[PDB]
């Protein structure tokens, strides 16, 4: 009883530590599976903001009436 | 009559009035297909660190 009192840790503390670690890593696993599914559908469709390889930018494009009428 | 047009009076970009109105879409073209939904808003902190293998937080 004395060794259990002065040197050890309570079973309630162990049990709530188990429930805490299972909750945390359950969040980890579900976020990771959602991450890989989001990544694969975002590559397959391209709607998301990630896999946007840099296209032509039109800020340098300035229209003006030229010398040739049919441009 | 007909005084000679001086230099540089065959220049000087000029207003002029017409009968028919100005057109829309002089390039016969469709609309822009699909705008990008922009991801906006202040960020929450990172959910459980890297979410790599280990070294959480």
The residue behind tokens 């049990």 is A15
Q: What is the largest CA-CA distance in chain A?
A: 101
Q: What is the DSSP string of chain B?
A: --PPPPTT-S-S------SSPPPS-SS-------PPPP--SPPPPPTTTT-SSS---
Expt. technique: cryo-EM
Tell me, in Å, the resolution of the deposited structure.
4.1
Length of chain B: 57
CB B55 within 8 A of CB B49: yes
The answer to whether A54 faces chain B, any CB pair under 8 Å, is no
| Element of type H or E holding A50 | none
HSE at residue B47, side-chain half, CA atoms within 13 A, is 12
Dihedral sign (CA A45, A50, A51, A56): positive
| Element of type H or E holding A49 | none
Nearest to A48 by CA among B21, B33, B39: B39
Q: How far is CA B4 from CA B8, B11, B14, B23, B34, in A?
A: 11, 14, 19, 36, 57
Distance from CA of A3 to the nearest CA of B (A): 33
- Residue in B36, B37, B48 nearest the CB of A27: B48
């Amino acid at each position: 009883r004395w060794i259990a009192r002065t040197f050890f840790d309570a079973p309630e503390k162990n049990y709530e530590r188990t429930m805490a670690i299972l909750q945390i890593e359950s969040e980890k696993a579900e976020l990771r599976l959602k991450e890989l599914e989001v990544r694969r559908l975002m590559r397959a469709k391209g709607d998301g903001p990630w896999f946007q390889y840099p296209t032509i930018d039109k800020a340098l494009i300035d229209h003006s009436p030229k010398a040739t009428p049919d441009n | 009559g007909w005084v000679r047009p001086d230099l540089g009076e065959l220049s000087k970009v000029t207003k002029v009035k017409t009968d028919r109105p100005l057109p829309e879409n002089p390039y016969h073209s469709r609309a822009r297909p699909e705008p990008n939904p922009e991801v906006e808003g202040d960020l929450k902190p990172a959910r459980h660190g890297s979410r790599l293998f280990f070294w959480t937080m």
